[PDB]
Design a protein around this ligand. Structure first.
Ligand SMILES: [Mg+2]
Ligand SMILES: [Mg+2]
Ligand SMILES: [Mg+2]
Ligand SMILES: [Mg+2]
Ligand SMILES: [Mg+2]
Lengths: 126, 56, 313
RNA sequence: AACGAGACUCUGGCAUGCUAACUAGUUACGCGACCCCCGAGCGGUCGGCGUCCCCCAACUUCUUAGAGGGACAAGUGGCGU
């Protein structure tokens, strides 16, 4: 048997999805026609294997993103999550409080407010 | 392949050339190499679309 | 509340069911085309034991059967196939009496004239073709036409002005003027390729759909986008009701029905829970066709079944 | 990035779908002829046997050989970071 697609079958199927993503549905016999229209595959046997990897990749891409294919419609949802996140309109705030040996680090840099104190358990970690 | 006679025996020559896929031409052959899939891609797809309806 | 309930299932096929046809002259007969190179004429014993039995199996084809439509009288069937041919059967014996040849590539759909004098088809060839019932090709619209697969064309049961509607993959709708075969008007929008288009019995609408997920309405003499209904995932095939002001759509796994007065869902027809371990658990619905009654619809799925749904109050 | 592997070329397996055939046929009857009742019948008619003779009959299942179609780990369930 074998059935380990060669790198010339796993590179067509990767370019095709990038260029034509909105045609390539999820069944095999329609993809076998779209692929025959868009590119020039000089054989029937090769055309079918390319169109058969396209379907695998399509089923996988209807989940999370795959690391060889950069499609337009799935960039923008990452671009969003980098532009901002649903969590906060405030900063994670300046109103935060700390403990000793830093009050004296500031006493030589001149701060005077919004802090706390607790002298830690009296020997190094255990 | 060819022969060459020199005053010390014979030499032989072998030459092989690979023709450069002349599409439809006469400089090389048609029908590119089998493992040569090639993808074509057009442009001008502007999606801006509200449902307008032209009339002829 | 007019609400649909699962009446029964039909079974016996061997591939996807892709089209269903019905005709008022015979209420017990139903025609279903499939993905196994054959079409089936059923015999509806409405007993709940099995709502039907396969009466006859028409054969002769080399590939998938994309479209099927019965004559106006209920004695001829016309079917169009991915092998690039149309066959005009004889629903008494079988015996395709006439066949049509010229499309270079897969015929995706066909339609019949209500006076049974003109035949139209569209194909992966990117061309509309009009024929006599003797199988001579009467006209080919290669110019003026879509630039991609002509996925579905329909005849308008209009009073007098003969016009045919077309929907393709270049995400356009095109209305035609018969007797001159020039494009009347276009209809633009529809981000995504188109799967179907269908007109109301009187003819004022074309409920079209496709990859957009939405069903758009259009006008047949005014020429405006009336409104959009938001459908969800994808729209396989659309159909208007015979006796009411309803539109039914086959979304991916389930059916949706809308009342056009106030543009609202009547219901979603689902199917039952299964323990399937996967994405796309549901077999998808492919094409659905109302009865002549208006009291039942059949819909064909991608698991070789045809399911029957009936209205109740 | 290149070669080898693979792709490729021939062949075997499937089409009652297409193209079309006295240098391949089949079915029919136009036949007719032979033979037996071998069965209704009588012996013809109803039938049975024919690589017996025909058709300017109908067709392509069998034969031949061309164009396309078909299979992709594609569907479903497990094991896989
Ligand atoms: Mg082989
Ligand atoms: Mg053979
Ligand atoms: Mg003989
Ligand atoms: Mg072949
Ligand atoms: Mg799996």
């Amino acid at each position: 048997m074998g059935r380990v697609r060669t790198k010339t079958v796993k590179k067509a199927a990767r370019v095709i999805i990038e260029k034509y993503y909105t045609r390539l549905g999820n069944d095999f016999h329609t993809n076998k026609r779209v692929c025959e229209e868009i590119a020039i595959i000089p054989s029937k046997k090769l055309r079918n294997k390319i169109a058969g990897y396209v379907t695998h990749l399509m089923k996988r891409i209807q989940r999370g993103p795959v690391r060889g294919i950069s499609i337009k419609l799935q960039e923008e949802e990452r671009e969003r999550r980098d532009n901002y996140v649903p969590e906060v309109s405030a900063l994670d705030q300046e109103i935060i409080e700390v403990d000793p040996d830093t009050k004296e680090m500031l006493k030589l840099l001149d701060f005077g407010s919004l802090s706390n104190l607790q002298v830690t358990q009296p020997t190094v970690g255990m | 392949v060819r022969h060459v006679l020199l005053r010390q025996g014979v030499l032989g020559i072998k030459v092989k050339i690979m023709l450069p896929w002349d599409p439809s031409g006469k400089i090389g052959p048609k029908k590119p190499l089998p493992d040569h899939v090639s993808i074509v891609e057009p442009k001008d797809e502007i999606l801006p679309t509200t449902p307008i309806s032209e009339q002829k | 509340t007019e609400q649909m309930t699962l009446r029964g299932t039909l079974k016996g096929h061997n591939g996807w069911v892709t089209q269903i046809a019905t005709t008022p002259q015979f209420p017990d007969m139903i025609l279903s085309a499939s993905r196994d190179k054959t079409i089936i004429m059923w015999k509806l014993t409405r007993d709940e034991t099995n709502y039907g039995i396969p009466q006859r199996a028409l054969r002769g084809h080399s590939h998938f059967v994309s479209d099927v439509v019965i004559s106006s009288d209920g004695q001829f069937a016309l079917s169009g196939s991915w092998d690039g041919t149309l066959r005009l059967w004889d629903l008494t014996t079988g015996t395709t009496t006439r066949r049509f040849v010229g499309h270079t590539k897969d015929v995706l759909s066909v339609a019949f004239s209500s006076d049974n004098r003109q035949i139209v088809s569209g194909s992966r060839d990117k061309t509309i073709k009009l024929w006599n019932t003797l199988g001579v090709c009467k006209y080919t619209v290669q110019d003026e036409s879509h630039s991609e697969w002509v996925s579905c064309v329909r005849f308008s049961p209009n009073s007098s002005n003969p016009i045919i509607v077309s929907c393709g993959w270049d995400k356009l709708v095109k209305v035609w003027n018969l007797a001159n075969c020039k494009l009347k008007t276009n209809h633009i929008g529809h981000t995504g390729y188109l799967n179907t288009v269908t007109v109301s019995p009187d003819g004022s609408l074309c409920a079209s759909g496709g990859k957009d997920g939405q069903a758009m309405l259009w006008d047949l003499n005014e020429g405006k986008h009336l409104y959009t209904l938001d459908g969800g995932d994808i729209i396989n095939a659309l159909c208007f009701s015979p006796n009411r002001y309803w539109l039914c759509a086959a979304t991916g796994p389930s059916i949706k029905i809308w009342d056009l007065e106030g543009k609202i869902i009547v219901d979603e027809l689902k199917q039952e829970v299964i323990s399937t371990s996967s994405k796309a658990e549901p077999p998808q619905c492919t094409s659905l066709a109302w009865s002549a009654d208006g009291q039942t619809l059949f819909a064909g799925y991608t698991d070789n079944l045809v399911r029957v749904w009936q209205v109740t109050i």
